UniProtKB/Swiss-Prot annotation, chains A, B, C, D:
Protein name: Potassium channel GORK
Domain text: The segment S4 is probably the voltage-sensor and is characterized by a series of positively charged amino acids. The pore-forming region H5 is enclosed by the transmembrane segments S5 and S6 in the Shaker-type (1P/6TM) and contains the GYGD signature motif which seems to be involved in potassium selectivity. The KHA domain (rich in hydrophobic and acidic residues) present in the C-terminal part is likely to be important for tetramerization.
Organism: Arabidopsis thaliana
This protein's UniProt keywords: ANK repeat, Ion channel, Ion transport, Membrane, Potassium, Potassium channel, Potassium transport, Repeat, Transmembrane, Transmembrane helix, Transport, Voltage-gated channel
Start-end of intramembrane regions: 209-228
Induction: Up-regulated under drought, salt stress and cold conditions. Induced by abscisic acid (ABA) treatment in roots and shoots but not in guard cells.
Length: 325, 325, 325, 325
């Protein structure tokens, strides 16, 4: 607590930086698969756009040597640079530094070898920012929990869908441009339009045609106007739909598990059903029918605070409600 | 209270009008996407229908200024007729007033501008009166609290495919009639029948083809004889099936939460399942291997009568059954 | 009772009759859509089969004034041959009586009017037997409940898509043979085999093609080799893929609800693994660990057999339990 | 005890053997449908592989007479090697010895009789070792037994589609090679590769094509470039997707119960959501929220998982903890 070259992690200049690299760790998570797939090296008018975005991430390298890490079991904020600067190199230092090398200038420098461009798939470790942003959005008791817990599983299931549409076009560009009729896009004809010589089509027609055959597959609709033709594309859509089957079952299971043990206000309307169904099975004279649901509304609005709340309560809370009521 | 200018909210001469406005709001929210998508301005018939579809809502928009409101906080009836007109002008006035302007004559008497027809979507706020019909049916006690959340959810799921079937046809008409072979309907050939010059086919063939696509996409069957061809129909199908993927898991999540607290055909087969871990684990007489299982057949729906709901609730009903026997 | 002109409801020679018309109730409710759709009047080789099948449902309509029942109030046997004839004649008499008429040649001996062959669709009220067989099986503890709850929903779901496969070919026979190219089967070509002049095709090829369509629609696969061509087949599959969309979300719901309320072994696994979960946060003794997991290895069965059903055993039944123990 | 012949069942040299035939019970389970579907007798290259794979199961069938079994009602490890003759010959002996003969050599030199090769399916009883591997992984308390039924039901859901992928190719070869255009592969054309004369394509192209069909059917995607054309392939696809529907519902039903049974951050929001409902009715201090919500992690798992899991435990460890303090 006596260092002062140390930011404790709720500053109004650090919370306004932590959300500044979340519109870069979203952009560099989306531009990275369609930088790998749709471009064999970036064009020259993106030279200014790709040198930034990596210039705002090595600012983040030096700036996380100075933030106060709150420990797990110690439950106190640690303030010494010796204790944060070693957990940084232990946990996340290679992930965020080897991705900050310019891999578009290296690829054009090395005689255009193809395998050096696979070292920009390590920029997909910047999805940590978005999943952490969704992670302490569950720990915010203001927003509907069923709204956020399904937005985390609808960020993942569409980001994986976006990535397995750039890989699916990359597997079409790996064949030469004379075995071009033996691929999923070079043999495509939609309406009165033919996708011949698909390296010259506009980027967004190629990207939309690729993403349509990942969202139609992800939703398990599968029209079959676009389908796999090669053998590597068959293997890729075997790997993809097998993982997407589990990813889709772990959304029904994640919605059901929040509806089943859902709102107790729905359970009150549920638990008056058997009351009415046994007062009206063997008919009782119509006397209390509204006063009972009013009294049980006032009861179950206080039944959780009758016994159930205050076995877990600490001292110096309940006496206030006890004196005020 | 001391007012005469207002109407009691449980009048059976007012709730015989809320059923009339219900079957007007059901009609003019199904026809409204059919007026948007399938017509560029209504024909010379359906004009008197277009004006009597709105002078049935003008009567309701002048009637709700004189209805009694039950307060949200104090749970009291608010009779005085300026705390309701201040309330009605704030919550529902301007999306119900601008849905009663004649947006077909305003379109045709303005030089036929296309963008003024997009104000025909504010008439889709009249599904308020259909979704509240399902909300005051849940708070009914006569039928299930969740079956009116299954018949409600199947209304919402099917209504969004009637709307998507009209937007999907509308996107085919935004292309010029000479480039019709690059659409989903202009390049269609189902059987020996070619769907060319598709603005001169009968209206019901066009609507049935579009609804056939939207419904076999909603159920995620997706045969593929009708698919997206443009880059705008690709984007629309990509938007639609993602929202449909979340709307189709909510149905399953509600049906599970209905079933998990059902009847004794799944509880009794846990009761005798736990009995047979004492009635067959510790060996028991075959004479008594009929007696208690016949008894636990005889208690549920007859002698059980949900005893805890007559245990925790006070004993005026017990005084009534003391008067019984 | 002193009547003796009534068969008792439980019997040796009567329960071997109800599982003899149970074979005729799974025959004559599976041959009935195949006789409506694929035939227009049975041929002469199938004459004696449609006569002997309807007299077995005629010696059974007279064998219901000779049987007792169990009313839900007295819950005893009600031997009186005039009470039963005013309950049988109310509920099950018309639907069980006019389905025994010889509808095959009543069609043939009335000038072959097609609308009189729609009155053999009420021979599908014979599936009362095949559903009371499955709702009798669920009150039987010889077999597990997870097998007789997912097979009642696999009888229903396969039977409805057997019916929707004969209706789907019937809608192709309602066009003339000069417009057979505008149907789903006359405009079919699977491989190098073309289904031209489909009335002159062997019955089982037509039935297998139609049922293969309806089964790959039921599972929501939907290949698209067989699709709806007309405007009346689109309407049928629009009804059908939206009915079985709820019928197949009701099956997932049952399989889920019969898993989340697991047996004793599942709760045993759960509570012992969450017992060992908090063990290695303190890391106590090794023989202590094994000894207390032995304590809760024998503290699952008789400890939680005993405490559960002692909440409900009636009087004079616990007494000989305590006497034997 | 006195017997020195037999292996003690928790040997260290019998846990490097049952993990040695678990890659021969995965090899001989994946290769046997590929030996049955894709060949007519093995080539003379693949000879010593078959012989080694069969001899390292003979060496196991004479090694399980030499072992003791844990009793399940007496719970003693039975060392007596005269009752190991029993519990093996009314157990897996004939389905370890009949499926151990050289069934390719019997087929190749007896006359090329096709029905002899159907006895290779006895070798699919060696999946019992792989399914008993997971059933010995359920009992490991150091891993969640609900996330050992998500890969157990995913091996089952992907082994049954590797097998179906070979039966689907086998039904294409039961037709003569001149009537190959009436198959699913002899009438296939993908891009510009016509799959004609399909017995001379190399093995991995045929296997990748058949597994591609079976896996996009298993996920219920179903593009429809590869569909059934025959009547045998139609009946097989009908049988396969009906099993697959129940298995896919069973996967969701098993995933759901994993999420319903507790989640700690979700349980923090299972309590905070109703705790604030009381607080906005009986309005406490707005500056007392920090006192309330801070202790909903302070005694979660520091008093919730500690003593509430311990009221079924004696205080012999509580004395150790109290002297620890
Ligand atoms: K499909
Ligand atoms: K398809
Ligand atoms: K599907
Ligand atoms: K599908």
């Amino acid at each position: 607590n006596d260092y002062k070259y140390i930011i404790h992690p709720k500053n109004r200049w650090y919370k306004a930086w932590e959300m500044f690299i979340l519109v870069w760790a979203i952009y560099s998570s989306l531009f990275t698969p369609m930088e790998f797939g749709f471009f064999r090296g970036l064009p020259e008018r993106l030279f200014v756009l790709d040198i930034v975005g990596q210039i705002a991430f090595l600012v983040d390298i030096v700036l996380q040597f100075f933030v106060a890490y709150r420990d797990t079991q110690t439950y106190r904020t640690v303030y010494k640079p010796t204790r944060i600067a070693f957990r940084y190199l232990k946990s996340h230092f290679l992930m965020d530094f080897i991705g900050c090398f310019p891999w578009d200038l290296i690829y054009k420098a090395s005689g255009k070898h193809e395998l050096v461009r696979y070292l920009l798939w390590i920029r997909l470790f910047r999805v940590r920012k978005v999943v952490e942003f969704f992670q302490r959005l569950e720990k915010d008791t203001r927003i509907n929990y069923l709204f956020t817990r399904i937005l985390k599983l609808l960020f993942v299931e569409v980001y994986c869908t976006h990535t397995a549409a750039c890989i699916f076009y990359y597997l079409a560009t790996t064949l030469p441009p004379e075995n071009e009729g033996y691929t999923w896009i070079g043999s495509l004809k939609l309406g009165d339009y033919s996708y011949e010589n698909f390296r010259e089509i506009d980027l967004w027609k190629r990207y939309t045609t690729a993403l349509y055959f990942a969202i139609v597959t992800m939703a398990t609709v599968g029209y079959g106007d676009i389908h796999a033709v090669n053998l590597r594309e068959m293997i890729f859509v075997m790997i993809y739909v097998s993982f997407d089957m589990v990813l889709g079952a772990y959304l029904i299971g994640n919605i059901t598990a929040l509806i089943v043990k859902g709102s107790n206000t729905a359970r009150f309307r549920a638990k008056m059903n058997d009351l009415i169904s046994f007062m009206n099975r063997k008919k009782l004279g119509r006397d209390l029918r509204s006063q009972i649901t009013g009294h049980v509304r006032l009861q179950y609005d206080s039944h959780y605070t009758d016994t159930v709340m205050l076995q877990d309560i600490p001292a110096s809370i309940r006496a206030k409600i006890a004196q005020l009521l």
